[PDB]
């Protein structure tokens, strides 16, 4: 793969040159589809190599959900040095893959014919996306995974074409997705930052290591946190808060250039707290008005090849809306809440207004860029601070 724009300039993209995306080299000054909507769609699934078959995964079958968990737990994204792998839980996967409007045929698996072993996956979920001055029904593509023994055999281009076909069959012709690799052609480039919460554990697993020159003692004291949040009236989101959280989010996001447009049902799905999946806290002020909220989701990782520590418990910044409480105070309380809940690290991207608090709250810049992409939509790229969209 190509993780930098340098190694990507030196590559030729045999697959992506065939797709309706802009070329890496060109710069974009227009707004609109790369190609028109198709009015006739291929009815037949694309051909797989011999011995493999398509299978749409019904995640309501607990056994099928577990097969997908295992495939991802063993074969999904790792860090650059093969030390950590994402470990999405089964319940998290249900959250991410069954939002309102989900379709079973958009949970697109590949199985071995003989054994029935799940060896490949890709998914789509519908979302309304606001991109500059246009709102489009799109899909979000997530969880592209090919078994390790099956790699470098073109299975991934077939998975992309097959989910494209199945999305086209439903009348949708644009998509949004992210990746750690550079591809034609990022609409924005964001950077992960990390806030140590349990610096001891993070150093013995080499997730981070001591800054020069500092002792383990100095490092702990530097990252210590209060034991309770400071903001008045902070409390977990409840059912009664769904409309006002929807209203707050909708107004807050109008200031960015790539955002979701959520219905009130989608707000309930994405923010209503679920233990070990998503946490949302609202600020209810002295008048009983909800004026701010913070949210973060739960995504641990496997620590590979380690005798004693098997997993890292990571919290990920989701959407944080402020209208009365300072963003800095809001995020400082998110750190405290994550610490209280047992998380080892708190991750956040530099999108939206996050740059205004990352350094002050002692985040350390990561080695990973997260590139954002649109399929069949041509528009100018944007700076990270204008991206107002967070995926799982």
């Amino acid at each position: 793969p190509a993780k930098t724009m340098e190694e990507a300039s030196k590559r030729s993209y045999q697959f992506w040159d065939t797709q309706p995306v802009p070329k890496l080299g060109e710069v974009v000054n227009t707004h609109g589809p790369v190609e028109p909507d198709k009015d006739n769609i291929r009815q037949e699934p694309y051909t797989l190599p011999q011995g493999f078959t398509w299978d749409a995964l019904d995640l309501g079958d607990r056994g099928v959900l577990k097969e997908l968990y295992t495939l991802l737990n063993e074969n999904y994204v790792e860090d650059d040095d093969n030390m950590f792998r994402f470990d999405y839980s089964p319940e998290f996967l249900l959250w991410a893959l069954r939002p309102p409007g989900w379709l079973p045929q958009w949970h697109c698996g590949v199985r071995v014919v003989s054994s029935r072993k799940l060896v490949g996956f890709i998914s789509a979920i519908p979302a309304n996306i606001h991109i500059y001055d246009t709102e489009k029904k799109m899909v979000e593509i997530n969880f592209l995974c090919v078994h390790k023994k099956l790699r470098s055999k073109r299975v991934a281009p077939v998975l992309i074409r097959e989910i494209t076909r199945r999305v086209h069959l439903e009348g949708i012709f644009q998509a949004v997705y992210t990746a750690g690799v550079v591809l034609p052609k990022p609409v924005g480039t964001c950077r992960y930052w990390h806030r140590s919460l349990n610096p001891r554990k993070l150093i013995e697993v080499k997730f981070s290591h001591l800054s020069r020159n500092m002792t383990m003692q100095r490092t702990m004291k530097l990252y210590r946190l209060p034991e309770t949040p400071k903001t008045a009236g902070l409390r977990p989101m409840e059912t009664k808060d769904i409309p006002v959280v929807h209203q707050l989010l909708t107004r807050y996001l109008k200031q960015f250039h790539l955002t979701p447009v959520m219905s009130q049902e989608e707000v309930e799905h994405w923010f209503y707290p679920q233990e070990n999946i998503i946490d949302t806290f609202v600020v209810e002020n002295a008048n009983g008005e909800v004026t701010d909220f913070l949210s973060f989701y739960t995504l641990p990782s496997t620590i590979m090849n380690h005798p004693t520590h098997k997993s890292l418990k990571a919290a990920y910044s989701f959407y944080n809306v402020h209208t009365q409480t300072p963003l800095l105070d809001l995020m400082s309380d998110a750190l405290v809440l994550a610490k209280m809940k047992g998380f080892d690290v708190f991750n956040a991207l530099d999108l939206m207004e996050n740059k205004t608090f990352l350094e002050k709250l002692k985040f350390g810049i990561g080695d990973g860029n997260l590139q954002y992409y649109l399929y069949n939509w041509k528009c100018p790229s944007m700076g990270a601070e204008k991206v107002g969209l967070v995926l799982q």
Partner: peptide
């Protein structure tokens, strides 16, 4: 979607 660790 992409696994980062401190630079």
């Amino acid at each position: 979607x992409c696994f980062s660790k401190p630079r």
